[PDB]
């Protein structure tokens, strides 16, 4: 097989400089992901309904899209009646 | 016309079976 030329993964993940850098970068990305949910930013970015944002106080009728081109406003008018 | 329904396959097999027999023998004769 030989080796292509890049630095072997084995020696990198066993190097100190690597874990000096990645003992900060990896947890930060983890925390960043945590904050993306705990702040509730994920809900507003993707438009995913919160546990209290599926129905109104007295409806079981599914807010289903029935139109094609006016579908955007049809979803927006669903968000309004909440 | 209300003909014999088996007449079609009987006629087809009447043609195919012996004709194939002759084609088989011929082709294997030329290849010798």
């Amino acid at each position: 097989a030989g080796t292509t030329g890049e630095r072997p993964f084995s020696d990198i993940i066993t190097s100190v400089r690597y874990w000096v850098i990645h003992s900060i970068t990896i947890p930060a990305l983890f925390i960043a992901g945590w904050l993306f949910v705990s702040t509730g930013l994920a809900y507003d970015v993707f438009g995913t309904p919160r546990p209290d944002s599926y129905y109104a106080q007295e409806q079981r009728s599914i807010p289903l899209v029935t139109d094609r081109f006016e579908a955007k406003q049809q979803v927006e008018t669903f968000l309004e009646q909440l | 016309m209300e003909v014999n329904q088996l007449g079609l396959i009987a006629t087809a097999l009447f043609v195919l079976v012996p004709s194939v027999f002759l084609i088989i023998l011929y082709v294997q004769t030329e290849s010798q």
Binding site: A1, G2, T3, T4, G5 | -
Partner: protein
């Protein structure tokens, strides 16, 4: 015609392959140099003029 079209996609691929690899469709080169297919040897894959 939808079934025939999908079927002809394979026809495109098959006869397409036959055209580009014509030199090796009866089998690959009898003593292909290992160095060619081994990594790191060439700077460019397949190019004999790119040995490091």
């Amino acid at each position: 015609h939808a079934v025939f079209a999908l079927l002809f996609f394979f026809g495109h691929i098959w006869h397409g392959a036959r055209t580009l690899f014509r030199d090796v469709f009866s089998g690959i080169d009898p003593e292909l140099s290992p160095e060619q297919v081994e990594w790191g040897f060439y700077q460019k894959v397949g190019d004999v003029t790119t040995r490091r």
